């Protein structure tokens, strides 16, 4: 029930501005310090900012001070990160996390727990581009091989991320969604596959649901033989 729900990711040009949101529920938000933490494949986890429970006191990492500002609206249970003068190097997944609790007569320990789900911030002069989705279909061949594979190729999009589900998240067993690969064109591609019994092709329908929030696109592709 303790939840942190992040929003506001996406693509911006270098020098631009973006505003992240972190909506809290399941606890008294005004009782806790909060933090922002970011993550890249290169530098790992990097703490970004901290704010105390009433929003009076704020702290920043050296790398973002003077460009990012943290704030909160306790009446709306919402934490914010205002990112100005964005740099190529600010590209990362951004998380919010709950920190120190404050009591009537003292304050508790320091924490990062729980964390929000994460939003991707990409800083780039390249333009958004939605994905081309193509079915990955078997053929009528492997009758006596009992399991069949099928999937969706999610091709030539930018930026990250796309999320792929199958049959609206009802089909999860055997699903493998691969990490995206950056192409020489500067666009991304990935596949999502799943294995099902051969006693299903023509018996039931399989649709991959591709969400690409940055371009504002949701694609559904039924995969057939």
């Amino acid at each position: 029930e303790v939840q942190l729900a992040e929003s506001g990711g996406g693509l911006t040009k270098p020098g631009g501005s973006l505003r992240l949101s972190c909506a809290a529920s399941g606890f008294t938000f005004s009782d806790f310090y909060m933090d922002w933490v970011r993550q890249t494949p290169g530098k790992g986890l990097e703490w970004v900012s901290r704010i105390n429970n009433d929003g009076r006191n704020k702290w920043y990492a050296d790398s973002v001070r003077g460009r990012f500002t943290v704030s909160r609206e306790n009446a709306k249970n919402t934490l914010y990160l205002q990112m100005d003068s964005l740099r190529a190097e600010d590209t990362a997944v951004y998380y919010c996390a709950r920190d120190r609790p404050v009591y009537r007569y003292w304050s508790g320990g320091y924490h990062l727990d729980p964390w929000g789900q994460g939003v991707v911030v990409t800083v780039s002069s390249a333009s958004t581009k939605g994905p081309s989705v193509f079915p990955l279909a078997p053929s009528s061949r492997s009758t006596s091989e009992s399991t069949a594979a099928l999937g969706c190729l999610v091709k030539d999009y930018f930026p990250e991320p796309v999320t792929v589900s199958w049959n609206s998240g009802s089909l999860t067993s055997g699903v493998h969604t691969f990490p995206a690969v950056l192409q020489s064109s500067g666009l991304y591609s990935l596949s999502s596959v799943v294995t099902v019994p051969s006693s299903s092709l023509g018996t039931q329908t399989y649709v991959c649901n591709v969400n690409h929030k940055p371009s504002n696109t949701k694609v559904d592709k039924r995969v057939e033989i």
Binding site: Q117, P135, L136, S139, T195
Partner: protein, 217 residues
């Protein structure tokens, strides 16, 4: 800045065995208030870090009892009593005694299981793709162990280099296997140039190479 260093960045592990991860800080982590604010987190692909241990040895609510933490000063260790399938992932230590908060580089746990040969599948391009610019042929290697695997593309019986890319999942949490995709991307005209497309797979679990193929059309 307090630097946090972990070891060993990778750990192969037999199920049911115990495992230990170390974390060293460049500065004592005792806080003015008497606590030592060193935490341990577990991260799975596509998810935020999940805290397991806080204040060196306190277990978070709902954390399996086989996780434990120890240490003091500048030396700390996470321990698993008996590793289970779901313990694969990347583990981080972090400190909250000093700003800026800082984290170790991460230690990836991999769980050795019984060798499993890949199920191989080849997917001919959907008719849709041809009338784009490029055409993508996908070869799938499903649910194998260990991770090392070799994929060769053959076009009309001739090896093809330089137009394929691989992508690999992380070790699965439930069955502890990997999967891999190899995608061959050709121009529209080139894909027309040839008739037969095959991917040949080599793996320790395969007594001979496995080849999957299709005829264009």
């Amino acid at each position: 800045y307090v630097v946090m260093t972990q070891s060993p960045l990778s750990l192969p592990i037999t199920p049911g065995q115990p495992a230990s991860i170390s974390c060293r800080s460049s500065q004592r982590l005792l806080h003015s208030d008497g606590n030592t604010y060193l935490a341990w987190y577990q991260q799975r692909p596509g998810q935020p870090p999940r805290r397991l241990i806080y204040e060196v040895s306190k277990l978070d609510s709902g954390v399996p009892d086989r996780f434990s933490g120890s240490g003091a000063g500048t030396d700390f260790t996470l321990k698993i009593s008996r590793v289970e399938a779901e313990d694969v992932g990347v583990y981080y230590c972090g400190q909250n005694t000093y700003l800026p908060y800082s984290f170790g580089q991460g230690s990836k746990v991999e769980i050795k299981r019984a060798v499993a040969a890949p199920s191989v599948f080849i997917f001919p391009p959907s008719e849709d793709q041809v009338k784009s610019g490029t055409v993508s042929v996908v070869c799938l290697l499903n649910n194998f162990y260990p991770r090392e695997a070799s994929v060769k593309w053959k076009v009309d019986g001739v090896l093809k280099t330089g137009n394929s890319q691989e992508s690999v999942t992380e070790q699965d949490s439930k069955d502890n296997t990997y999967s891999l995709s190899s995608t061959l991307t050709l121009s529209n005209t080139d894909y027309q140039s040839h008739n037969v497309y095959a991917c040949e797979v080599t793996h320790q679990g395969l007594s001979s190479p496995v080849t999957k193929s299709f005829n264009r059309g």
